[PDB]
Amino acid sequence: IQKAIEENNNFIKMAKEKLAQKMESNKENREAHLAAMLERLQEKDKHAEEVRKNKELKE
Amino acid sequence: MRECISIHVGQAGVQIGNACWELYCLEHGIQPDGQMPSDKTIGGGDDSFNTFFSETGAGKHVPRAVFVDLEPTVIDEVRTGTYRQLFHPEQLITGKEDAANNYARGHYTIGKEIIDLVLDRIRKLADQCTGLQGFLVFHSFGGGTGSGFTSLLMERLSVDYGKKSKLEFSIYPAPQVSTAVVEPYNSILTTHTTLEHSDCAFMVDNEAIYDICRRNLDIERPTYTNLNRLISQIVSSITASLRFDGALNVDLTEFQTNLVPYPRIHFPLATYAPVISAEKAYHEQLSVAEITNACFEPANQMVKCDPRHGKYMACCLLYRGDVVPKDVNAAIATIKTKRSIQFVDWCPTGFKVGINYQPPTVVPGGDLAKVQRAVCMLSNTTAIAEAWARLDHKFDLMYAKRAFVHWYVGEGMEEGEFSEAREDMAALEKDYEEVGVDSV
Amino acid sequence: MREIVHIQAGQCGNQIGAKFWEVISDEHGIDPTGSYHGDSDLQLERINVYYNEAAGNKYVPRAILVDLEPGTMDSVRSGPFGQIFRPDNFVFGQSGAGNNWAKGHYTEGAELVDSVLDVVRKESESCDCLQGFQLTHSLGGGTGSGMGTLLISKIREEYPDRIMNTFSVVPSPKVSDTVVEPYNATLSVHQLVENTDETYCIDNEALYDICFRTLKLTTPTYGDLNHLVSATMSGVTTCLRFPGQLNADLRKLAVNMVPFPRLHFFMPGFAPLLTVPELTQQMFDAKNMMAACDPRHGRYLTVAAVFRGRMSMKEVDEQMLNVQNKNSSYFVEWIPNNVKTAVCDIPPRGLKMSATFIGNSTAIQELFKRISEQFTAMFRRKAFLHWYTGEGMDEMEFTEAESNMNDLVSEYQQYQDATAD
Ligand SMILES: Nc1nc2c(ncn2[C@@H]2O[C@H](COP(=O)(O)OP(=O)(O)OP(=O)(O)O)[C@@H](O)[C@H]2O)c(=O)[nH]1
Ligand SMILES: Nc1nc2c(ncn2[C@@H]2O[C@H](COP(=O)(O)OP(=O)(O)O)[C@@H](O)[C@H]2O)c(=O)[nH]1
Ligand SMILES: Nc1nc(NCc2ccc3c(c2)OCO3)cc(-c2cccc3[nH]ccc23)n1
Ligand SMILES: [Ca+2]
Ligand SMILES: [Mg+2]
Ligand SMILES: [Mg+2]
Numbered sequence: 031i032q033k034a035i036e037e038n039n040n041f042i043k044m045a046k047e048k049l050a051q052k053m054e055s056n057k058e059n060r061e062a063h064l065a066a067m068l069e070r071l072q073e074k075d076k077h078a079e080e081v082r083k084n085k086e087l088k089e
Numbered sequence: 090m091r092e093c094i095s096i097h098v099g100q101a102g103v104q105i106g107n108a109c110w111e112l113y114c115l116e117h118g119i120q121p122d123g124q125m126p127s128d129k130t131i132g133g134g135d136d137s138f139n140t141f142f143s144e145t146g147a148g149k150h151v152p153r154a155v156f157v158d159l160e161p162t163v164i165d166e167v168r169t170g171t172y173r174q175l176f177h178p179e180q181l182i183t184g185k186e187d188a189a190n191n192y193a194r195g196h197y198t199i200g201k202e203i204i205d206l207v208l209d210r211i212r213k214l215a216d217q218c219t220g221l222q223g224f225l226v227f228h229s230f231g232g233g234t235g236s237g238f239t240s241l242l243m244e245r246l247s248v249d250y251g252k253k254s255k256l257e258f259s260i261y262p263a264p265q266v267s268t269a270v271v272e273p274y275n276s277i278l279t280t281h282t283t284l285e286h287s288d289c290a291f292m293v294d295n296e297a298i299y300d301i302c303r304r305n306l307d308i309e310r311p312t313y314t315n316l317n318r319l320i321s322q323i324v325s326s327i328t329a330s331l332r333f334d335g336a337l338n339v340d341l342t343e344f345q346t347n348l349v350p351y352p353r354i355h356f357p358l359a360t361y362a363p364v365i366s367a368e369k370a371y372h373e374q375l376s377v378a379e380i381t382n383a384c385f386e387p388a389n390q391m392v393k394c395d396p397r398h399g400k401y402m403a404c405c406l407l408y409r410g411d412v413v414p415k416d417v418n419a420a421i422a423t424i425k426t427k428r429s430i431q432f433v434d435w436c437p438t439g440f441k442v443g444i445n446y447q448p449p450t451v452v453p454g455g456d457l458a459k460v461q462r463a464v465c466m467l468s469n470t471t472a473i474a475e476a477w478a479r480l481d482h483k484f485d486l487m488y489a490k491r492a493f494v495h496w497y498v499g500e501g502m503e504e505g506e507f508s509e510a511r512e513d514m515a516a517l518e519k520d521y522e523e524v525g526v527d528s529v
Numbered sequence: 530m531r532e533i534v535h536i537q538a539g540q541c542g543n544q545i546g547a548k549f550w551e552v553i554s555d556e557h558g559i560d561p562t563g564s565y566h567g568d569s570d571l572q573l574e575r576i577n578v579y580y581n582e583a584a585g586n587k588y589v590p591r592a593i594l595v596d597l598e599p600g601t602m603d604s605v606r607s608g609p610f611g612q613i614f615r616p617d618n619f620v621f622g623q624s625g626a627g628n629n630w631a632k633g634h635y636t637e638g639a640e641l642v643d644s645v646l647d648v649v650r651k652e653s654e655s656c657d658c659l660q661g662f663q664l665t666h667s668l669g670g671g672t673g674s675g676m677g678t679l680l681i682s683k684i685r686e687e688y689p690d691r692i693m694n695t696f697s698v699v700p701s702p703k704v705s706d707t708v709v710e711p712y713n714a715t716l717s718v719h720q721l722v723e724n725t726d727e728t729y730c731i732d733n734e735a736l737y738d739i740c741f742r743t744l745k746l747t748t749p750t751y752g753d754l755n756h757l758v759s760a761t762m763s764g765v766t767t768c769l770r771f772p773g774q775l776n777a778d779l780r781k782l783a784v785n786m787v788p789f790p791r792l793h794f795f796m797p798g799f800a801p802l803l804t805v806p807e808l809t810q811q812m813f814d815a816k817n818m819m820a821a822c823d824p825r826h827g828r829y830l831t832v833a834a835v836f837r838g839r840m841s842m843k844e845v846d847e848q849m850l851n852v853q854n855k856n857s858s859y860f861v862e863w864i865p866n867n868v869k870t871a872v873c874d875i876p877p878r879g880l881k882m883s884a885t886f887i888g889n890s891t892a893i894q895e896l897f898k899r900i901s902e903q904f905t906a907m908f909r910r911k912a913f914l915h916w917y918t919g920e921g922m923d924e925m926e927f928t929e930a931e932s933n934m935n936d937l938v939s940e941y942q943q944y945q946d947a948t949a950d
Binding site: 191309489 | 530783
């Protein structure tokens with residue numbers, strides 16, 4: 031009866047740790063994808079500023 | 090006691106839920122307002138139908154059920170429809186934005202925002218049980234919610250209710266009826282992620298249901314309503330042993346013992362008879378023998394595969410209606426002398442038989458004839474692995490090009506989950522091969 | 530509860546936008562005042578996708594109108610239905626862009642973009658659950674092509690998780706002789722490859738050839754081209770506007786149609802320009818495509834077919850299977866079940882039966898080759914480059930845009946040549 035209790039608890043434990051690891055890893059990956067996209071858009075805003083300056087300093 | 094909680098996930102799960110609960114109401118004489126005049130014990134009882142319905146002090150009989158979808162329009166039809174009074178509003182749970190046919194959104198991005206609420210409502214149902222037996226989970230393989238949220242939920246249920254039994258009714262995708270190209274991805278991801286968390290899963294191949302509706306009901310182009318009414322007849326046959334009393338009734342759990350020789354080998358093939366129109370049923374009474382013979386005709390299977398090219402590991406027959414053992418035994422004797430029924434060598438060949446005398450019911454205005462007697466066979470056959478093969482092949486075709494994979498990666502999944510799931514399916518196909526080999 | 534925000538930019542964008550709103554307002558029984566005068570609840574069941582409800586049971590398009598030329602603001606407002614649009618949703622500049630992409634994207638358009646975003650944000654804030662955005666514009670002018678892609682980039686910054694869809698009118702010498710058109714299109718395509726989920730390539734080449742050869746119009750006007758465009762766009766939004774059975778949103782459609790993020794440029798088609806077999810055969814005919822591409826010179830990654838009118842769903846299913854079986858070589862074998870079908874009971878005006886086609890075909894590379902050739906013809910002589918460098922742009926940006934569009938071509942070719950075995 032103790033072995034049975036232990037096996038049920040180990041199944042609960044391992045599923046809890048696997049789920050938590052997956053959800054954390056997923057959160058980190060999603061946030062990194064959005065941060066890379068935003069960083070590319072910020073590089074665009076930087077390039078648009080360098081364009082507007084080039085145009086100002088052409089005059 | 091020993092109650093059962095039903096959970097209906099995504100569009101297909103919800104709509105099958107609607108067909109199933111409507112049918113249960115008709116079988117037990119429960120009106121759409123929830124009243125049951127034949128039930129003389131007000132507000133409680135330990136009648137067989139209380140495994141699926143609780144009772145309020147006001148005499149309302151309330152499904153032990155949760156409906157969950159990540160968008161609202163299907164469950165909104167339940168909220169406004171004929172049976173809106175059957176369900177407490179807290180049993181009908183909806184988000185605002187669906188999983189867009191993307192497992193990753195149902196399991197992570199959107200699913201994470203509603204999982205705790207869903208668990209709280211399920212907990213509310215469980216606390217009303219004096220001896221909860223387990224869960225029935227209704228969902229498609231192919232939708233974003235039915236795949237990913239169902240997987241998430243199964244994992245959390247294993248945490249919160251331990252080894253408490255969990256059964257699935259799983260809608261297997263077919264190109265013939267409203268499909269998404271990425272459905273094979275979602276199917277492999279959910280089968281992989283749910284495999285260790287499910288004790289028994291009844292797969293329903295939409296192509297099989299579609300063919301049966303066309304061939305036997307003379308329906309040119311079956312709708313979800315036709316398919317779900319038939320599916321509900323199969324579900325009702327399976328749960329009838331839990332919902333009715335009787336001396337020849339045989340518990341579903343007792344069949345489950347026989348249907349599942351190893352934890353992973355837990356996918357029974359369902360076959361149902363008779364599926365016949367009213368026009369063809371007239372002046373043609375189908376006997377125990379005729380319906381039992383039908384059970385071994387592959388055109389009546391719920392999953393397309395050929396049991397004639399595999400081996401049986403179990404074979405149960407669940408009869409309902411005007412059926413006595415004598416006619417069952419004569420029919421089985423005939424089938425044993427006439428058909429290609431080969432068992433693996435490590436398991437006895439006896440068929441397990443249950444009978445329920447409550448007769449089959451049909452929904453009014455339906456396309457199914459009312460019959461005096463019906464039968465559902467549940468067999469554990471290696472041939473069902475063919476359905477995995479078909480699905481695995483479609484997965485491989487797409488995954489070799491990474492087609493559509495960016496939709497999953499963008500929601501936070503990694504390719505490693507794709508290849509892990511696919512390898513788990515490869516090992517499953519190998520298991521089904523190994524169990525069919527003969528002993529030393 | 531499933532709101533789409535619509536944006537139209539520049540002369541072309543505003544013209545085809547107006548025709549689109551005319552056509553769908555008619556389909557929903559909405560008159561120019563915004564009153565419902567239809568006969569059927571199916572017209573109103575998904576009205577909120579495109580229309581807000583205002584006081585008095587008024588339906589107001591969820592529509593933003595953008596140009597650097599304010600004469601189009603007047604022409605839209607007096608055009609048929611001009612009062613239906615929200616007056617605060619008109620956002621107009623002063624001096625035009627002169628077919629100069631850099632004015633639209635970097636200087637004048639940058640100046641106006643914030644007021645455009647203010648209107649976008651006010652519309653979005655009141656959405657129950659915004660699904661995303663559709664933009665109508667041409668790629669050959671200055672305002673729509675440059676400023677529209679600016680708006681796309683800024684929306685993506687503020688709504689990175691919403692779908693961005695364009696209807697992009699690709700230039701042709703048969704309709705405009707403006708010599709700088711290929712620069713504006715290449716510079717725009719470079720943006721679109723990165724920042725949209727789906728782009729319908731509506732090719733003025735194909736629309737001209739349809740009006741001339743098939744419809745027998747000796748002198749095609751913009752009105753005749755836009756009649757075809759509006760019929761296509763009505764067809765392609767039919768499934769989200771009348772649902773019937775299909776339960777979808779822009780993201781689920783995109784997920785079904787876009788197998789690789791860069792390869793999201795679709796060929797629209799329409800038939801007729803009649804049995805179901807005839808519709809089906811014609812809809813797959815090169816002559817019915819709204820992009821001047823032969824789909825038999827490539828392979829379909831994905832296809833959506835939308836049938837409108839009263840017809841047998843059995844017969845439609847049988848014919849779609851027949852066309853796939855008889856044309857199997859034109860569908861890549863490694864995406865199973867890549868052809869999707871919708872049926873809407875409500876036909877468009879003046880037809881009993883019609884078909885709208887959306888193809889994700891590698892033959893779209895022929896469009897990109899065409900534009901690419903014209904780009905190079907000028908870029909190899911640096912012709913007209915001072916128009917752009919004078920706004921601060923470097924040649925390097927032109928080199929990169931050319932290189933990215935050529936990469937897109939090569940990728941379409943790679944997937945055309947790929948095999949399962
Ligand atoms: N048998 C049957 N299958 C259905 C039904 N409704 C949908 N399906 C199948 O389910 C799959 C589509 O998944 P859905 O259940 O609609 O998707 P979902 O769970 O709502 O997930 P998302 O909508 O993507 O968020 C396809 O294979 C459909 O054919 C139904 O009522 N009966
Ligand atoms: N099909 C179609 N094409 C148009 C229409 N109006 C303009 N065009 C095309 O659009 C290009 C000119 O760009 P335009 O949008 O008018 O410039 P802008 O509005 O100032 O940004 C030319 O290549 C024309 O061929 C129209 O109503 N229909
Ligand atoms: N990607 C894609 N496909 C479309 N075709 C029809 C279709 C029907 C049933 C389907 C299906 C596709 O795929 C799964 O089942 C339309 C669109 C669209 C684009 C931009 C704006 C839009 N406003 C309304 C619609 C829409 N976008
Ligand atoms: Ca007869
Ligand atoms: Mg759904
Ligand atoms: Mg201009």
